[PDB]
Write an enzyme that holds these catalytic residues in place. Structure first.
Site, PDB file in Angstrom:
ATOM      1  N   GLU A 174       0.828  -1.214   0.000  1.00 58.06           N
ATOM      2  CA  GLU A 174       0.000   0.000   0.000  1.00 58.06           C
ATOM      3  C   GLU A 174       0.862   1.264   0.000  1.00 58.06           C
ATOM      4  OE1 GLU A 174      -1.192   3.207   2.433  1.00 58.06           O
ATOM      5  OE2 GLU A 174      -1.687   1.516   3.746  1.00 58.06           O
ATOM      6  N   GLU A 228       7.018   4.585  11.019  1.00 61.45           N
ATOM      7  CA  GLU A 228       5.578   4.441  11.243  1.00 61.45           C
ATOM      8  C   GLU A 228       5.336   3.470  12.405  1.00 61.45           C
ATOM      9  OE1 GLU A 228       3.340   3.121   7.697  1.00 61.45           O
ATOM     10  OE2 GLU A 228       1.729   4.405   8.385  1.00 61.45           O
TER      11      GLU A 228
HETATM   12 CO   LIG Z   1       1.083   3.297   6.510  1.00 62.00          CO
END
Ligand SMILES: [Co+2]
Ligand SMILES: [Co+2]
Lengths: 17, 414, 414, 14
Positions: C48, C125
């Protein structure tokens, strides 16, 4: 969504948002 | 965008839209953390919370049950120069929404029992932002930048201050600012004339402003704050000088922030994340008040790359300031702002908050075409110029990391 | 709401809205962290991110520049059973948006240079989500509830797996899951046939699904995970069995969660926050999957109050599971659901998102009236009987605090 | 319906 508020960048100060 | 004023001074700003069923009601009040004084720091916000703790007619629970029965689309927040209470309801309940909001605004009793328990939720609310390093570090920055001026004080206030807030301190504060000149009811969407009459007949009751707030003007201090916290990432915030709310070149500042770290294609996002992959989060935003303002950069990276990250953010801001931005970049920004503004028009809460906030802080309004022109009119000359003035200043630093000590890389910066 | 199934299996679901001038586009793929295997955990989420790193004709930066010039309203998210790529643009740019989104989907260039880079961002992240105790705590709850099942895998993956990731794993996975049976295109707003046919023509290229995915069913266990971290509040989560997406009694669960902690009038918000002043944040939500599902409660309070919070929550979840709902509450719940749903009809993303998600996870399309009937059709004892079945079970528990040791949540004494 | 879990942490960018 669409419904926009008016907050800043980082500092909670609402009822539950 | 019809704007009207009552005798007490409160202004009613409205805007009818034609493809919506809902309506957005917003009670704006021109006071917040900035208007407070050391000892009552946090009062503006704590007040916003008590408005939901019960009145004579309906209890805190009945208040929750009402808004829930109408979507649950209610909320309120407090800033440095304004407080806000709003809702989004299907028109057939807009009258009821106004009736409940009025009762809260006027006949809200601050019982000893409620005011006690609610002080705790704010104590929890305070610890919660405290446990969120990527959130509180922004506030630690406001502190460094404005030292001991009210622009540096936390919205939520301190714990020693809350510990004393009584119904007396509340009403004293409230009875000063919650008056005509600060109140502004904003409505947008399926606005019916019947609702406007109910608003005028209600917010006429608010008392005229007798008090005359006299405030100090802040001063930018290139200070630095560092808090030691067991974290995985080092959270950095760098503040620079900005511009006042209604300044000549606000739009140039908007466009500048856009090129700086305000979007996917911004210098910061492309240099720090896109090419180096130093941060997952790197961005910038402008904070403007009626007499001061600041441009803020944020970045999270692992404890090691804090030196590397700093030099990197340094290069970018350095190069932007000195060399300016290209016309392609300036045109890419205008398209972004214009398109962003367009898509927002579809939202009722979006138009309401814009009008209310404008009236309350700028007092002036502009039609969509007026707004688009202002965005167009900006010249690369302007933006690049501003970039040099602002980004060539010594910035303020707020940092949260494992050791709690400043990085070595945090030195050279002229 | 039109629907369309091409020959490769791809589905085009559309909804036209004249009232708007915008349009939301979404590419919903039916795969997520659940479909991954031990070694490839995080592959769905990496893919993604990698979808924005560049195609044969558009580089990472060019992709960024495009979406910024059209408002910048583009985003991507990976869940446990689906992934999503969407954007919002003005009518006069939908074509281009589709071309760019399309080219990213089909012609991405997983360059090692860009992939080595992106791997680092994802690593940030992960650490960032880690420095957010109120967020990572929800992830741990899935780990304690499902143990080694793929539902217990963190969507971002682990540093180990990510390091094993390469263009090979990506394409091998993309080939199996990014196919006919899994792709759904959702478009809502001011759509013109032209654009729809463009979508039709383009997404025909999607190869038919040939891989037969075999999925095992999960087992819910009341296990506990605790993490020692330096924080102000104790972040807590409790999990109760829920219902699987298809389940007929989903509207029953929706209403049951609303009463529990899904609103202001919810039991938890009133009992734990409004009355006790224990938590600033306490709420509940439900997660429904293919074969499994589960109700979740979150709460955060100062350490010194953790034992009291568990008891207080315990009391609330009991009188609910035992006695059930009231008639006033059941209707309040319905008024809310109907109200919010009605209010969401103004957002194109909102419809686009709803449509694509149901078509993907229900293979069904539910109209307004249809959904509204459901809400109303729910009888007061459907909820009660449900709350008794679900809320009685021994809950799974997640917790983050300072001493890092479980409190006294094993006995029922007070 | 909607499948919005808890705190976001799976989006694209900051
Ligand atoms: Co992400
Ligand atoms: Co608050």
């Amino acid at each position: 969504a669409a419904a926009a508020a008016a907050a800043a960048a980082a500092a909670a100060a609402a009822a539950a948002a | 965008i019809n704007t009207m004023t009552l005798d007490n001074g409160v202004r009613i700003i409205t805007e009818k839209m034609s493809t919506v069923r809902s309506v957005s009601i917003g009670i704006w009040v021109g006071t917040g953390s900035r208007y407070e004084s050391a000892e009552e720091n946090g009062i503006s916000h704590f007040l916003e919370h008590m408005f939901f703790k019960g009145t004579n007619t309906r209890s805190a629970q009945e208040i929750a049950e009402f808004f829930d029965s109408i979507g649950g689309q209610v909320n309120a927040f407090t800033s440095k120069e304004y407080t806000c209470y709003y809702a989004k309801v299907l028109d057939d309940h807009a009258g009821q929404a106004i009736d409940t909001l009025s009762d809260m605004f006027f006949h809200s009793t601050f019982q000893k029992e409620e005011l006690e328990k609610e002080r705790k939720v704010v104590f929890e609310e305070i610890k919660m932002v405290d446990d969120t390093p990527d959130d509180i570090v922004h506030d630690l920055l406001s502190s460094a930048t404005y030292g001991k001026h009210s622009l540096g004080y936390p919205i939520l206030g301190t714990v020693e201050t809350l510990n004393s807030f009584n119904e007396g301190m509340l009403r004293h504060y409230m009875d000063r600012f919650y008056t005509g000149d600060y109140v502004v009811i904003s409505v947008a969407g399926n606005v019916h004339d019947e609702l406007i009459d109910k608003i005028k007949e209600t917010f006429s009751q608010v008392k005229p402003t007798t008090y005359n707030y006299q405030g100090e003007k802040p001063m930018f201090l290139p200070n630095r704050i560092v808090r030691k916290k067991e974290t995985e990432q080092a959270h950095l915030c760098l503040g620079y000088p900005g511009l006042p709310i209604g300044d000549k070149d606000v739009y140039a500042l908007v466009l500048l922030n856009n090129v700086l770290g305000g979007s996917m294609s911004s210098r910061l996002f492309q240099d720090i994340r896109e090419k180096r992959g130093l941060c997952y989060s790197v961005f910038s935003y402008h904070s403007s008040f009626r007499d001061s303002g600041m441009l803020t950069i944020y970045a999270g990276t692992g404890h090691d790359q804090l030196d590397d990250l700093v030099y990197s953010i340094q290069e970018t801001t350095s190069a932007l300031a000195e060399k300016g931005l290209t016309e392609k970049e300036l045109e890419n920004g205008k398209e972004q702002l214009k398109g962003s503004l367009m898509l927002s028009l579809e939202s009722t809460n979006s138009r309401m908050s814009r009008n209310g906030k404008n009236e309350l802080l700028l007092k002036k309004h502009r039609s969509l075409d007026e707004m688009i022109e202002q965005i167009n009119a900006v010249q690369k000359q302007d933006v690049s110029r501003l970039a040099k003035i602002l980004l060539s200043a010594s910035p303020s630093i707020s940092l949260i990391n494992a050791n709690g000590e400043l990085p070595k890389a945090l030195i050279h910066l002229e």
